[PDB]
Enzyme design. Structure first.
Site, PDB file in Angstrom:
ATOM      1  N   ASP A 146       0.803  -1.182  -0.017  1.00 24.43           N
ATOM      2  CA  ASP A 146       0.144  -0.051  -0.048  1.00 24.43           C
ATOM      3  C   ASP A 146       0.965   1.238   0.010  1.00 24.43           C
ATOM      4  O   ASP A 146       0.720   2.240   1.026  1.00 24.43           O
ATOM      5  CB  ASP A 146      -1.143  -0.099   1.051  1.00 24.43           C
ATOM      6  CG  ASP A 146      -1.967   1.167   1.028  1.00 24.43           C
ATOM      7  OD1 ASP A 146      -2.276   1.739  -0.185  1.00 24.43           O
ATOM      8  OD2 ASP A 146      -2.613   1.659   1.879  1.00 24.43           O
ATOM      9  N   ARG A 150      -0.198   8.634   1.619  1.00 27.75           N
ATOM     10  CA  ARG A 150      -0.802   8.565   2.966  1.00 27.75           C
ATOM     11  C   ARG A 150       0.117   7.871   3.905  1.00 27.75           C
ATOM     12  O   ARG A 150       0.104   7.782   4.972  1.00 27.75           O
ATOM     13  CB  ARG A 150      -2.015   7.973   3.084  1.00 27.75           C
ATOM     14  CG  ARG A 150      -2.387   6.511   2.560  1.00 27.75           C
ATOM     15  CD  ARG A 150      -3.586   6.011   2.323  1.00 27.75           C
ATOM     16  NE  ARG A 150      -3.787   4.852   1.469  1.00 27.75           N
ATOM     17  CZ  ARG A 150      -3.614   5.132   0.168  1.00 27.75           C
ATOM     18  NH1 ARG A 150      -4.108   6.279  -0.356  1.00 27.75           N
ATOM     19  NH2 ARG A 150      -3.742   4.063  -0.553  1.00 27.75           N
ATOM     20  N   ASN A 151       1.140   6.841   3.170  1.00 26.97           N
ATOM     21  CA  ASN A 151       1.633   5.921   4.004  1.00 26.97           C
ATOM     22  C   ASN A 151       3.284   6.326   3.940  1.00 26.97           C
ATOM     23  O   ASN A 151       4.157   5.685   4.302  1.00 26.97           O
ATOM     24  CB  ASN A 151       1.665   4.612   3.614  1.00 26.97           C
ATOM     25  CG  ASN A 151       0.462   4.053   3.998  1.00 26.97           C
ATOM     26  OD1 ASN A 151      -0.017   4.451   5.178  1.00 26.97           O
ATOM     27  ND2 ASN A 151      -0.266   3.166   2.971  1.00 26.97           N
ATOM     28  N   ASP A 164       4.065   1.696   7.816  1.00 26.00           N
ATOM     29  CA  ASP A 164       3.360   0.727   7.600  1.00 26.00           C
ATOM     30  C   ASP A 164       3.832  -0.414   6.466  1.00 26.00           C
ATOM     31  O   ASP A 164       3.233  -1.092   6.041  1.00 26.00           O
ATOM     32  CB  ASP A 164       1.833   1.016   7.265  1.00 26.00           C
ATOM     33  CG  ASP A 164       0.984   1.762   8.071  1.00 26.00           C
ATOM     34  OD1 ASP A 164       1.571   1.654   9.223  1.00 26.00           O
ATOM     35  OD2 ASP A 164      -0.155   1.820   7.962  1.00 26.00           O
TER      36      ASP A 164
HETATM   37  O1  LIG Z   1       0.730  10.680  12.920  1.00 25.24           O
HETATM   38  C1  LIG Z   1       1.589  11.650  12.997  1.00 25.24           C
HETATM   39  N1  LIG Z   1       3.190  11.512  13.405  1.00 25.24           N
HETATM   40  C2  LIG Z   1       3.573  10.197  13.568  1.00 25.24           C
HETATM   41  N2  LIG Z   1       4.929  10.127  13.553  1.00 25.24           N
HETATM   42  N3  LIG Z   1       5.295   8.848  13.362  1.00 25.24           N
HETATM   43  C3  LIG Z   1       4.288   7.874  13.197  1.00 25.24           C
HETATM   44  C4  LIG Z   1       4.116   6.648  13.152  1.00 25.24           C
HETATM   45  C5  LIG Z   1       2.890   5.974  12.912  1.00 25.24           C
HETATM   46  C6  LIG Z   1       2.747   4.650  12.793  1.00 25.24           C
HETATM   47  C7  LIG Z   1       3.831   3.940  13.311  1.00 25.24           C
HETATM   48  C8  LIG Z   1       3.680   2.328  13.078  1.00 25.24           C
HETATM   49  C9  LIG Z   1       2.491   1.945  12.352  1.00 25.24           C
HETATM   50  O2  LIG Z   1       2.148   0.568  12.408  1.00 25.24           O
HETATM   51  C10 LIG Z   1       1.496   2.783  11.980  1.00 25.24           C
HETATM   52  C11 LIG Z   1       1.624   4.161  12.037  1.00 25.24           C
HETATM   53  C12 LIG Z   1       1.832   6.822  12.698  1.00 25.24           C
HETATM   54  C13 LIG Z   1       1.852   8.156  13.101  1.00 25.24           C
HETATM   55  C14 LIG Z   1       3.201   8.929  13.314  1.00 25.24           C
HETATM   56  C15 LIG Z   1       1.168  13.016  13.248  1.00 25.24           C
HETATM   57  C16 LIG Z   1      -0.295  13.178  12.835  1.00 25.24           C
HETATM   58  C17 LIG Z   1      -0.714  14.476  12.766  1.00 25.24           C
HETATM   59  C18 LIG Z   1       0.215  15.682  12.951  1.00 25.24           C
HETATM   60  C19 LIG Z   1       1.357  15.613  12.915  1.00 25.24           C
HETATM   61  C20 LIG Z   1       2.080  14.194  13.023  1.00 25.24           C
END
Ligand SMILES: O=C(Nc1n[nH]c2cc(-c3ccc(O)cc3)ccc12)c1ccccc1
Length: 282
Positions: A146, A150-151, A164
Site C-alpha cells: 500500500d 498517506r503511508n 506501515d
Molecule cells: O501521525 C503523526 N505522526 C507520526 N509520527 N510517526 C508516526 C508513526 C505512525 C505509525 C507507526 C507504526 C504503524 O504501524 C502505523 C503508524 C503513525 C503516525 C506517526 C502526526 C499526525 C498529525 C499531525 C502531526 C503528526
C-alpha cells in the site's frame, strides 16, 4: 506475559505518554531511549492495543515489531526504537514524524487560493527519498502492498519515511475518503499478485500525488469504473508543473507488463540525476 528482548526493551517508567496521533498511536517522550544517553528525552510514536483488542490484534502488533527488527534501519523508513513487553500492555516505540503524512505535507504547502512553499527540486527530492526507502525495503525482500503518499511520513527535518511496511475490501475508503484500489497494480487488483514490480506501479501513483501537491487520483471514479479504465489501459493525465521526463517515469512505472517497469534501483539512480539538474529557484 511476553518474553523480553533486552536489546530493544525500554522500562515502562521511561515512556511519558501524551496525546493521540491516530491499533492506536500516541505521541510520547522516551527518557534514555539510547543506553549511552540515559538523560536525553526523545519525541517518539507509541503503537498499542485499543480497549476492545482481540488475540489476533496483539499477534499482528508483535508481527509488525518483529518484522521491523528483521528489516533493520534506514533513513527513509519509520525505524523501531524500542518496546515495552514486561508488566503491562505491549508498547511498540517507533520514530515520530512531526509534519504528518506526505499528502498532508504537500496540501499544506500548496500556493495561495500557507507558511512554507516547496521548490521543483524539493518535490523531486521527496520522490528520490521515497524511492531510496523503497529500494532499501526491496533489498530486504519487503513488499509494501500500500505505497501511497498517506503511508509516507515527514519528520521535523523534512525527511521522507515509509510507514506501515511491517504490517482487502475494494469498496472501503481511507479516513480522507479515497479508495486504496487506485494505487494497486492491475496484476495485484485482478490476480492478487503482489511483487516489488506492483510496488513500482504504486510508486508511479505516488509520483503523481507529489507533482499534484497531494492531488486525489481518479476523483469521482467508483471501483467498477476504475476496473474498466485499467482494462482499457487508461493512464492518468500529466500534472501541470511536471517535466516530460517525470511524466515518462510515471508512465514507465505504469507499464502493463510488470517485467518492463523500472526497478527501485533504477528509479533511485534516475531521480538522483534529476534532483541535481532540477531548479530550486521556483
Ligand atoms: O501521525 C503523526 N505522526 C507520526 N509520527 N510517526 C508516526 C508513526 C505512525 C505509525 C507507526 C507504526 C504503524 O504501524 C502505523 C503508524 C503513525 C503516525 C506517526 C502526526 C499526525 C498529525 C499531525 C502531526 C503528526
Amino acid at each position: 506475559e511476553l518474553p523480553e528482548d533486552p536489546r530493544w526493551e525500554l522500562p515502562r517508567d521511561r515512556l511519558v505518554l501524551g496525546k493521540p496521533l491516530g491499533g492506536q498511536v500516541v505521541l510520547a517522550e522516551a527518557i534514555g531511549l539510547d543506553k549511552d544517553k540515559p538523560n536525553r528525552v526523545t519525541k517518539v510514536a507509541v503503537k498499542m492495543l485499543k480497549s476492545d483488542a482481540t488475540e489476533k490484534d496483539l499477534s499482528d502488533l508483535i508481527s509488525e515489531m518483529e518484522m521491523m527488527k528483521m528489516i533493520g534501519k534506514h533513513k527513509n523508513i519509520i525505524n523501531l526504537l524500542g518496546a515495552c513487553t514486561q508488566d503491562g500492555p505491549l508498547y511498540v516505540i517507533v520514530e515520530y514524524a512531526s509534519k504528518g503524512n506526505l499528502r498532508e505535507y504537500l496540501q499544506a504547502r500548496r500556493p495561495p487560493g500557507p507558511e512554507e512553499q516547496l521548490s521543483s527540486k524539493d518535490l523531486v527530492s521527496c520522490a528520490y527519498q521515497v524511492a531510496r526507502g523503497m529500494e532499501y525495503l526491496a533489498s530486504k525482500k519487503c513488499i509494501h502492498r500500500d505505497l501511497a503518499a498517506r503511508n509516507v511520513l515527514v519528520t521535523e527535518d523534512n525527511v521522507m519515511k515509509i510507514a506501515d511496511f511491517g504490517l482487502i475490501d475494494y469498496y472501503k475508503k481511507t479516513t480522507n475518503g479515497r479508495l486504496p484500489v487506485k494505487w494497486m497494480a492491475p496484476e495485484a487488483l485482478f490476480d492478487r499478485i503482489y511483487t516489488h514490480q506492483s510496488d513500482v506501479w504504486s510508486f508511479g501513483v505516488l509520483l503523481w500525488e507529489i507533482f499534484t501537491l497531494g492531488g486525489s487520483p481518479y476523483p469521482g471514479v467508483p471501483v467498477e469504473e476504475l476496473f474498466k479504465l485499467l482494462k482499457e489501459g487508461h493512464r492518468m493525465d500529466k500534472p501541470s508543473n511536471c517535466t516530460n521526463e517525470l511524466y515518462m517515469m510515471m508512465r514507465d512505472c505504469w507499464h502493463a507488463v510488470p517485467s518492463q517497469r523500472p526497478t527501485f534501483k533504477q528509479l533511485v539512480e534516475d531521480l538522483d540525476r534529476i534532483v541535481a539538474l532540477t531548479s530550486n529557484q521556483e
